Design a binder for this molecule. Structure first.
Ligand SMILES: CC1(N)CCN(Cc2ccn3ncnc(Nc4cc(O)cc(Br)c4)c23)CC1
Length: 293
């Protein structure tokens, strides 16, 4: 570990325990000695050849003001490490789904989370970045009375700017080795093609099927190439057998997109809102992990 327990960063953030990472950087839960709340602290070695924290802080700062984004607390660089401190969130959607009796969320919870996640994807795209690792463990519910029903997008370590300085789409590289988690990667990512906005929406599509059905066909198939070949040959409409019928428009829309084209986020938002309206799903409903009725 880069930092041991009780290490104090900038005489303010006291490391409590490691909560993630290890390879590119490490993430800790820390005590803010000024404000007295716990926070998340990510560190990366100053000697590391591939350093992402400067880009990760840049995305986090650009997103301040948007919903579904952690508050920026601080950042810095010294001779041993670079660091970023941000608001700490709670339970992630991978753990919440596995804690459900049959490993599935209800359609009520699935669709409401889908709307929140779509909002966060449109937000990162609006500031010129792709997330590239949209997955349930990168979405966490709040941990406060003011946030416990809000879902947050986490971790910009694998993000990439898809625009130049003037808002134009950058050229795609001729090959781009995909970095994201195998289970939720799009077929385009599996082909090592430059990712676009549509590839983050493919990851959302797979997450929502997994939430409502409880599994994907390639779950626990670990080999990258084999998973991509299954997805390439799999009839995606078969994934929609027990999903709301309007998801066929979502699938058809994202299947029509290419690297360059801006998605129709409103079309996808309507798929979720219309699916909820038809089933009488309201925003005030308890999420599955909430008790008392
Ligand atoms: C599984 C994952 N990808 C995402 C979850 N973190 C652990 C975790 C648990 C609760 N929270 N709240 C805020 N930020 C977190 N991570 C975080 C990620 C960053 O990239 C930068 C910073 Br600062 C914190 C985090 C481990 C790496």
């Amino acid at each position: 570990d880069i930092l041991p327990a009780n290490y104090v960063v900038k005489d303010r953030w006291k490391v409590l325990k490691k909560i993630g990472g290890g390879g590119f950087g490490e993430i800790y839960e820390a005590m803010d000695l000024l404000t007295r709340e716990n926070v998340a602290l990510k560190v990366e070695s100053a000697q590391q050849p591939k350093q992402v924290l400067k880009m990760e802080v840049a995305v986090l700062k650009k997103l301040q003001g948007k919903d579904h984004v952690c508050r920026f607390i601080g950042c810095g660089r010294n001779e041993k490490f670079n660091y970023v401190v941000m608001q700490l969130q709670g339970r992630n959607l991978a753990d919440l789904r596995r804690s459900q009796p049959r490993g599935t969320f209800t359609l009520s919870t699935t669709l409401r989370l889908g709307k929140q996640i779509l909002e966060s994807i449109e937000a990162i795209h609006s500031v010129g970045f792709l997330h590239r690792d949209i997955k349930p463990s990168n979405f966490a519910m709040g941990r406060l009375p003011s946030t416990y029903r809000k879902c947050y997008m986490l971790d910009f370590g694998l993000a990439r700017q898809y625009t130049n300085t003037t808002g134009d789409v950058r050229p795609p590289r001729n090959v781009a080795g995909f970095r994201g988690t195998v289970r939720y990667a799009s077929v385009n990512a599996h082909k090592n093609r430059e990712m676009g906005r549509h590839d983050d929406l493919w990851s959302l599509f797979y997450m929502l099927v997994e939430f409502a059905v409880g599994q994907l066909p390639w779950r626990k198939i670990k080999d990258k190439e084999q998973v991509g070949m299954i997805k390439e040959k799999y009839e995606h409409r078969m994934l929609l057998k027990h999903m709301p019928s309007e998801f066929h428009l979502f699938l058809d829309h994202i299947a029509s997109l290419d690297y360059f084209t801006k998605p129709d986020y409103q079309l996808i938002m309507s798929v979720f809102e219309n699916s909820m309206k038809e089933r009488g799903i309201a925003e005030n409903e308890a999420f599955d992990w909430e008790k008392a009725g």
